[PDB]
Amino acid sequence: KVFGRCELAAAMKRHGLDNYRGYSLGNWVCAAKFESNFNTQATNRNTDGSTDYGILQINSRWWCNDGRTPGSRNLCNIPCSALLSSDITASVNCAKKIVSDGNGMNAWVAWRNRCKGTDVQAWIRGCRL
Ligand SMILES: CC(=O)N[C@@H]1[C@@H](O)[C@H](O[C@@H]2O[C@H](CO)[C@@H](O[C@@H]3O[C@H](CO)[C@@H](O[C@@H]4O[C@H](CO)[C@@H](O)[C@H](O)[C@H]4NC(C)=O)[C@H](O)[C@H]3NC(C)=O)[C@H](O)[C@H]2NC(C)=O)[C@@H](CO)O[C@H]1O
Ligand SMILES: [Cl-]
Ligand SMILES: [Cl-]
Ligand SMILES: [Cl-]
Ligand SMILES: [Cl-]
Ligand code: NA
């Protein structure tokens, strides 16, 4: 599924991501935009053999099991394919664990390089919410 911008904002807010660990909703929408272009089916391979999955590009080295990232963790206790669902529940629940693990949203490289410090509230402009 390719979410619309306000559609994703609403879903993220409903699932409790707005101001989760102090990160306002626009931060999360911006992160999803540049991680996946709002596409729940996005996958990308990393150089260490891991893969990033879904709307928030969650990485199999740490967070989910894909069966082909040897020596990795599965800290969200979920198959990585569950992070590709049209329903973002699993991705949000896992993202909450990620952003709580010490580095905040710096876990998302696209957030750090493209969202951090910018006018992220613009990402929810026009949305009812
Ligand atoms: C080439 C490139 O940059 N590719 C990007 C992917 O790397 C990235 O997916 C992210 O992958 C990184 C690197 O593996 C990962 O970051 C690591 O996360 C772990 C777990 O949180 C950190 O370990 C914690 O460190 C803190 C602070 O020291 C400790 O307090 C805590 O105890 C540690 N936790 C554990 C379980 O040991 C690593 O420090 C951290 N490493 C680095 C270098 O930052 C991110 O979590 C991955 N992000 C996501 C969302 O999964 C991917 C993101 O979409 O983007 C690629 O481009
Ligand atoms: Cl957009
Ligand atoms: Cl594995
Ligand atoms: Cl980047
Ligand atoms: Cl915001
Ligand atoms: Na894994």
Swiss-Prot record:
Sequence similarity: Belongs to the glycosyl hydrolase 22 family.
Superkingdom as given in the UniProt entry: Eukaryota
Role, per record: Lysozymes have primarily a bacteriolytic function; those in tissues and body fluids are associated with the monocyte-macrophage system and enhance the activity of immunoagents. Has bacteriolytic activity against M.luteus.
Miscellaneous information on this protein: Lysozyme C is capable of both hydrolysis and transglycosylation; it also shows a slight esterase activity. It acts rapidly on both peptide-substituted and unsubstituted peptidoglycan, and slowly on chitin oligosaccharides.
GO molecular function: beta-N-acetylglucosaminidase activity; identical protein binding; lysozyme activity
Localisation: Secreted
PANTHER family in alphabetical order: LYSOZYME C (PTHR11407:SF28)
The keyword Ion transport is assigned to this record: no
Group of enzyme by EC: hydrolase
EC number: 3.2.1.17
Protein name: Lysozyme C
Tissue: In the egg white and polymorphonuclear leukocytes.
Gene3D superfamilies found in the cross-reference section: 1.10.530.10
Domain C-type lysozyme, residue spans: 1-129
Disulfide pattern: C6-C127, C30-C115, C64-C80, C76-C94
Amino-acid positions noted as binding substrate in the UniProt annotation, renumbered to this chain: D101
Main location: secreted
Catalytic residue positions: E35, D52
GO CC annotations, alphabetized: cytoplasm; endoplasmic reticulum; extracellular space
